[PDB]
Amino acid sequence: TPSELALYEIRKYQRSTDLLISKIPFARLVKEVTDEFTTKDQDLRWQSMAIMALQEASEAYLVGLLEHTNLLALHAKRITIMKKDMQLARRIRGQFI
């Protein structure tokens, strides 16, 4: 049954504590974003521990948002998180908006 494997990997990710997004692509993403903010005279410089810090905060925020979306999904009688549910979570928590 798909539910058995799904719940098994839910268990392993409930007691998992590793990063889930690829390090080199994430570093490139923040790299190119902060070059986008920059003037043409220079280029910024970054450090690995800063990269881990930003990624850690990013996924803290993401896990909070996703669990709130799951709670909205339970409210809406649907086990599927959908576009309107995610919109509602973003609005209600209303950070930097």
Added chain:
DNA sequence: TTCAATGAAATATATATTTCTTACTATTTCTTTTTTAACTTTCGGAAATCAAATACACTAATATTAAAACGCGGGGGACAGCGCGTACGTGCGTTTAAGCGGTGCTAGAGCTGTCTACGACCAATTGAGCGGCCTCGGCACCATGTGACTTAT
């Protein structure tokens, strides 16, 4: 009978296992020198009393009056069951880019010496505003000297 084959016991040896020993390294502790906290007066300014004296928010009493509570009904909406369907999950199969380890190198972080330069603090001048006093010019009044006129010597 005499000799040969076999069995039993002691012994020598091979082997595997355990323990001692030793090398290497990481951890803990002793030692010396350096920063950073610690102890001592000092003085000024903040903070703890003491006496007013004036806003200030209940607590009383009371009518109009808007607001709130009870009751019956009805039509709207929440809820539930059945049914068609699809969109997300899965099952494999490749293949793609992530992860890790070396390679260089150059832009850039970090500590130090130095000079310049803002800036806090203090001193003194200046401007501005408000009266207050001084000073000069002006009507009301009496005082005054001279000309005109008259009289008698």
